[PDB]
Amino acid sequence: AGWNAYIDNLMADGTCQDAAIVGYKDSPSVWAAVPGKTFVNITPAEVGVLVGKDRSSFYVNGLTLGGQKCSVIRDSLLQDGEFSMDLRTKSTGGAPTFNVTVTKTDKTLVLLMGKEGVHGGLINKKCYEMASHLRRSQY
């Protein structure tokens, strides 16, 4: 329970602009998300591609989250040990892009988006430690 607590902790820093906890087994659904941003709009369909078996067009085609187009920098989402995927939003001529990290637990996907100028290495670190935290309550 209390999935909002995890979102609140992830957002306490001020360096992040979006975060969401999404259940992806059977019937994917957003369990907790930042109101009014992009992750709150993820659809079961996009989730299907994330935990998806076909991970080829990822590097050369990217993917989308809550409608937002993204590029894939690294994908170890299913590879054991790491369990995370690092993306960068896709922007227009000169629009600022943002770092995104997706981490997978037993039952959920933890997503985090940083603000402009925040290192990916940091978004990844916070997402990763948060996912580690949830697998302990067997989630």
Curated annotation (Swiss-Prot):
GO biological process assignments: actin cytoskeleton organization; modification of postsynaptic actin cytoskeleton; modulation of chemical synaptic transmission; negative regulation of actin filament bundle assembly; negative regulation of actin filament polymerization; negative regulation of stress fiber assembly; neural tube closure; positive regulation of actin filament bundle assembly
Organism annotation: Homo sapiens
Residue(s) carrying Phosphotyrosine: 128
Modified residues (N6-acetyllysine): 104, 107
Gene3D superfamilies attached to this UniProt entry: Dynein light chain 2a, cytoplasmic
UniProt crosslink position (Glycyl lysine isopeptide (Lys-Gly) (interchain with G-Cter in ubiquitin)): 53
Gene name per UniProt: PFN1
InterPro entries linked to this entry: PFN (IPR048278), PFN_euk (IPR005455), PFN_sf (IPR036140), Profilin1/2/3_vertebrate (IPR005454), Profilin_CS (IPR027310)
Gene Ontology MF annotations: actin binding; actin monomer binding; adenyl-nucleotide exchange factor activity; cadherin binding; phosphatidylinositol-4,5-bisphosphate binding; phosphotyrosine residue binding; proline-rich region binding; RNA binding
Name assigned to this protein: Profilin-1
UniProt cross-references to Pfam families, sorted A to Z: Profilin
Expression sites (tissue/organ): Expressed in epididymis (at protein level).
Post-translational modifications: Phosphorylation at Ser-137 reduces its affinity for G-actin and blocks its interaction with HTT, reducing its ability to inhibit androgen receptor (AR) and HTT aggregation.
Modified residues (Phosphoserine): 27, 56, 84, 137
Keywords: Acetylation, Actin-binding, Amyotrophic lateral sclerosis, Cytoplasm, Cytoskeleton, Disease variant, Isopeptide bond, Neurodegeneration, Phosphoprotein, Ubl conjugation
Quaternary structure and interacting proteins, as annotated: Found in a complex with XPO6, Ran, ACTB and PFN1. Interacts with ACTB. Interacts with VASP. Interacts with HTT. Interacts with SH3BGRL. Occurs in many kinds of cells as a complex with monomeric actin in a 1:1 ratio. Interacts with ACTMAP.
Biological function: Binds to actin and affects the structure of the cytoskeleton. At high concentrations, profilin prevents the polymerization of actin, whereas it enhances it at low concentrations. By binding to PIP2, it inhibits the formation of IP3 and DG. Inhibits androgen receptor (AR) and HTT aggregation and binding of G-actin is essential for its inhibition of AR.
Family, similarity comment: Belongs to the profilin family.
Position of the Glycyl lysine isopeptide (Lys-Gly) (interchain with G-Cter in SUMO2) cross-link: 53
Lineage of source species: Eukaryota, Metazoa, Chordata, Craniata, Vertebrata
Sites of N-acetylalanine modification: 1
